[PDB]
């Protein structure tokens, strides 16, 4: 996260770290959506241009974390993966269309002050909240600058941007399965997700019921925090029928 700040303790209790077993390193962010299911970006698991194709046994999920590098004894919980599910129409060839994946844990994780699931939006919450100017919150342990790495989880609040402005900011083909967020050059304020924040959540706190909903997944950007560029996020609601199909079939 570029131009963000340290998270408060328990601020994002759905935050998940995807962790490579060997070598031991951060792979991505992710989010907890139930006691057995974690949501992330498909490119965190499968990206052939970079020879990335992880299997279940390659990976761990670390839940309840705040420090990036510490083993947070008695706080974090570490889970093994039973199965990965990647969207069948995930477009790794071109533009990361449908950049979404689910991971089922081998065993349920115990909730705590530090570990708690985020809600997924329904149609009405998404329609109400996914509006230009409305701000969401992005969190992660990724790079602090485009060109180091944080001691603890970083957070930044960013406004959703009008679709024509998103489209006009890039040569990449944008789809309805994406939205973009970030400040415009004339708005002064700054901030973006960056490499290493992939797969983490873009959340919004509904003013109707005071619950946090995950509207997006960190997907892509061209550089990080560049003037005139925006961060692109997987549109969770648009892909929720697939999420529900996987959980209903394999839960």
């Amino acid at each position: 996260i570029v131009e963000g700040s340290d998270a408060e303790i328990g601020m994002s209790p759905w935050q998940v770290m995807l962790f490579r077993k060997s070598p031991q390193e951060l792979l991505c962010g992710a989010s907890l959506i139930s006691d057995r299911w974690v949501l992330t970006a498909a490119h965190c698991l499968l990206y052939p241009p970079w020879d990335k194709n992880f299997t279940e046994n390659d990976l761990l999920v670390r839940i309840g974390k705040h420090s990036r590098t510490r083993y947070e004894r008695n706080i974090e919980k570490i889970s093994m993966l039973e199965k990965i599910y990647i969207h069948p129409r995930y477009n790794w060839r071109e533009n990361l269309d449908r950049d979404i994946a689910l991971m089922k844990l081998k065993k349920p994780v115990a909730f705590s002050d530090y570990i708690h699931p985020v809600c997924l939006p329904d149609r009405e919450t998404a329609a109400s909240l996914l509006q230009a100017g409305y701000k969401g919150r992005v969190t992660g342990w990724g790079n602090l600058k485009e060109t180091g790495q944080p001691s603890v989880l970083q957070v930044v609040n960013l406004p959703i941007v009008e679709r024509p402005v998103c489209k006009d900011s890039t040569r990449i083909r944008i789809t309805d399965n994406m939205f973009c967020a970030g400040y415009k050059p004339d708005e002064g304020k700054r901030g973006d997700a960056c490499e290493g924040d992939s797969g983490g959540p873009f959340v919004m706190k509904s003013p109707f019921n005071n619950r946090w909903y995950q509207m997006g997944i960190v997907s892509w950007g061209e550089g990080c925090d560049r003037d005139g560029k925006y961060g692109f996020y997987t549109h969770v609601f648009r892909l929720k029928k697939w999420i529900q199909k996987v959980i209903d079939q394999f839960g």
Binding site: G10, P13, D113, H116, P117, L129, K135, P207
Partner: peptide, 28 residues
């Protein structure tokens, strides 16, 4: 989950984090 999106250290104890108001103010 019926309890989703309600944080133990914030919503569950009626405490606000330091920047959630910025989100609320943007929801016009």
């Amino acid at each position: 989950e019926a309890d989703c999106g309600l944080r133990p250290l914030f919503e569950k104890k009626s405490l606000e984090d330091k920047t959630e108001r910025e989100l609320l103010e943007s929801y016009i």
